[PDB]
Structures are given as structure tokens and as C-alpha cells.
From a paper:
Here, we take a structural approach to assess the relatedness of these eukaryotic-like proteins in Asgard archaea, the closest known prokaryotic relatives to eukaryotes. Asgard archaea roadblock, longin and [name] domain-containing proteins form dimers similar to those found in the eukaryotic TRAPP and Ragulator complexes. Here, we adopted an X-ray crystallography approach to compare the structures of a potential Asgard Rab small [name], several RBs and two [name] proteins to their eukaryotic counterparts, with a focus on Thor and MKD1. We conclude that the emergence of these protein architectures predated eukaryogenesis, however further adaptations occurred in proto-eukaryotes to allow these proteins to regulate distinct internal membranes.
Finally, we investigated the [name]-like proteins from Thor. The crystals were pink in color indicating potential Zn2+ binding. We further analyzed the homology around the Thor-[name] Zn2+-binding site. We found that the predicted Zn2+-binding sites and the experimentally determined sites are not completely conserved in positions of the coordinating residues, rather they appear in similar regions and appear to serve the same function in tethering the β-sheet to the D α-helix to create cavities. Interestingly, mouse [name] has evolved to replace the Zn2+-binding site by a hydrogen bond. We speculate that Thor-[name] may also bind small molecules, potentially being involved in ligand transport. The cavities appear to be accessible from the exterior close to the dimerization interfaces. Furthermore, we uncover structural evidence that [name]-like proteins exist in several branches of Asgard archaea and are likely to share a common ancestor gene with the V4R-like domain.
Author numbering:
A (entry chain A): 3 to 49, 55 to 157
B (entry chain C): 3 to 157
Write the structure that this text describes.
């Protein structure tokens, strides 16, 4: 049923602490992003000829990174809706399984992945900004992260 | 292949900051046990455990069976050794492939229980099933030993 109970419980603890420490939902989001960026290096180590540049190559690399971290492909990788960005959709996000928060729309419970993906892309020569577009933890049907190529 | 890289990296961040802040070394172990007890409190309710064990545990055989079932639920394997020390009223848990300290190599930190979070988790779970215990880590591959070992003191 629930995949990686240990990871989701430890991350729940991290989210609880950040929420208790910050003074706004915006800053909580940014702190979770920063956490993910800090972890990206170690995650990259524990897991060809020229840096990729096209959005199709970026989307393929995103699919490969998602397979490597989560043993599966993303529900959707979309290069059409937003333009200049790639939207990653997952209907069974590992981070927010069974998490139901009320009155917290706009809080990206799963922004750690924004940071992880931003750091991994940076290591591969892809400069980007990533934020969580929506989270099932706050009522959405899926989780969506927005990767903007800068 | 490092198992569970996300969990390991997040726990590596937590121990790093919990080695930058705390006073001594033993209170760092207590902070890690406390973290583990919170995680175990949360863990008994999203249930891969409730289906795979009994609600009420008392006897020594029940305790050993509970430790093995909890290990197989949380880590998808049973530990290398579960040794019941009846004359000491304890249980020694040995694991040669602990998930927490994979590829961790800390210099001159013997006595630091890098993997005490499991002490907290197990203490909370045993407690939830009616077993008053005190769990602490005796050795950790992260600090130079060949195995990780935890001690369940039964009270
Ligand atoms: Zn999510
Ligand atoms: Zn260990």
C-alpha cells in the first residue's frame, strides 16, 4: 500500500519542523526547495558526450531521473501547456502518500523534489528553476512540478 | 547498489545537522532515538505492520517474533541475528547490511550511534504492542565495526 514508510515519516518530520520555524507558506516552500538542492549531490552520487539542451532531451532526462529515484515513469511529462517549461505530473507521489492537509492550498508539501531535480539538472549542464505547481497533500488529484529552463 | 538513496541522503542530512548542534555525543544519540520514536509513533498507523503481526505481545518468543516481523516489514529482510539473552533480560539485534549507514565512513567517532533512529523506531513499536523496552545501539558500520548491533533491554 504505502511505499517507503520510513522516507515519508522522516520527511513529514522535516516538513513539520520547517512549518514551525517559518512565518509564511512562501518561505516554507523555499526552505523545502533549499533542502532538496542540498540533498541533490549525495542523491546523484548514490544512484554521454555533451550537455543536452533541447526540451525533448530535458524531458527524457527527467523521465530517466524519475525512473532512477522512484522505480517508475512519471504520470505525465508535458512540454505543451506552459511553453518554455516542462510540467511533471505524478498521481502517486511518494512524498505525500496519505497526507491530507486542510487550509493549506499554495503550500507545496513536496517541494523537496523541486530542489532535488533542480540540482540534478544543474549537474547535467541544464540551468532551471523548479517549483511545485500543485500537491495532492493540499487537495489536488495529482502532484505537479514546473521546470522552467532559464 | 545503495538501497533507498532518498532515505539515506535525508537521514545523512539530519545526522549532519544533529552533529553540528548537540552538546556531547550521547545526547546526539538521544536526539536520534527521539526522532526514531516520533517516526515509530507515526509508523504504527500507516500499516504494513498491523496486518503482519499480533496486537498483544508478551512472552520472549512473542518478542523475538515481533522484532523479526517488524524488521521484515520496514526493511524487507530479517536481521542477521536475533539473540535472546535471558540471563541478561535483553535481545541483541545484529544486521550486516543496515540501511541507515550504507557507505558511511566516520573517522574516530566510536560510541556515536549513527543508526540510533532504529532504536527509537523499535522502542516505539515494541511499546505500542505492550513491551516496555530501552533500545540503544552498541556498534555501527558507520564508525568502523563490521556490523550494526542494537540492544533491547526488556523492562
Ligand atoms: Zn506529492
Ligand atoms: Zn547502521
Amino acid at each position: 500500500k504505502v511505499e517507503n514508510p520510513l522516507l515519508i515519516s522522516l520527511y513529514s518530520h522535516y516538513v513539520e519542523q520547517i512549518l514551525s520555524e517559518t512565518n509564511s507558506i512562501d518561505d516554507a516552500n523555499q526552505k523545502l526547495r533549499d533542502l532538496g538542492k542540498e540533498l541533490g549531490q549525495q542523491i546523484y552520487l548514490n544512484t554521454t558526450k555533451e550537455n543536452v539542451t533541447t526540451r525533448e532531451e530535458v524531458a527524457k532526462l527527467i523521465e530517466n531521473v524519475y525512473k532512477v529515484l522512484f522505480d517508475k515513469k512519471p504520470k505525465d511529462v508535458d512540454m505543451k501547456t506552459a511553453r518554455g517549461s516542462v510540467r511533471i505530473t505524478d498521481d502517486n507521489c511518494v512524498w505525500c502518500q496519505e497526507v491530507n492537509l486542510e487550509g493549506m492550498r499554495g503550500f507545496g508539501y513536496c517541494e523537496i523534489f523541486s530542489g532535488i531535480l533542480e540540482s540534478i539538472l544543474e549537474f547535467k549542464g541544464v540551468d532551471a528553476k523548479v517549483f511545485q505547481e500543485m500537491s495532492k497533500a493540499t487537495g489536488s488529484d495529482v502532484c505537479v512540478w514546473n521546470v522552467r529552463l532559464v
